[PDB]
């Protein structure tokens, strides 16, 4: 597929499809938004509860 073609950070899937933690506001690949697409990973999502 066309995911990770012109990407040095191919592992992070180019970080094309970004959204960001409605807390700190850091942009990341939606895949890392394990807080059900609201916040980034553990520290942040849990901090909102
Ligand atoms: Zn965060």
Cα 14 to Cα 9: distance, rounded to the nearest angstrom: 5
Q: Domain-by-domain residue ranges, the chain?
A: 1-49
**Alpha-carbon gap, residue 30 to 27, rounded angstroms:** 9
Q: State which approach was used to obtain the coordinates.
A: NMR
Structure tokens at 31: 């895949």
Topology (CATH) of 1-49: Wheat Germ Agglutinin (Isolectin 2); domain 1 (3.30.60)
- Report yes or no: 14 and 4 within 8 Å, Cβ to Cβ: yes
Check the CA dihedral 25-31-35-36 and report its sign: positive
Alpha helices in 1-49 (DSSP H): 42-48
Q: Give the whole-angstrom CA distance, residue 37 versus residue 24.
A: 14
Binding-site members for Zn(2+) are 21, 24, 40, 44
Reading the block at residue 48, the tokens are 């909102």
Ligand 1 centre and the CA of 12: distance in Å? 17
């Amino acid at each position: 597929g066309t995911r990770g073609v012109d990407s040095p950070s191919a592992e992070l899937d180019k970080k094309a499809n970004l959204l960001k933690c409605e807390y700190c506001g850091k942009y990341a690949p939606a895949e890392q938004f394990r807080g059900s697409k609201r916040f980034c990973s553990m520290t942040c999502a849990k901090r909102y509860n």
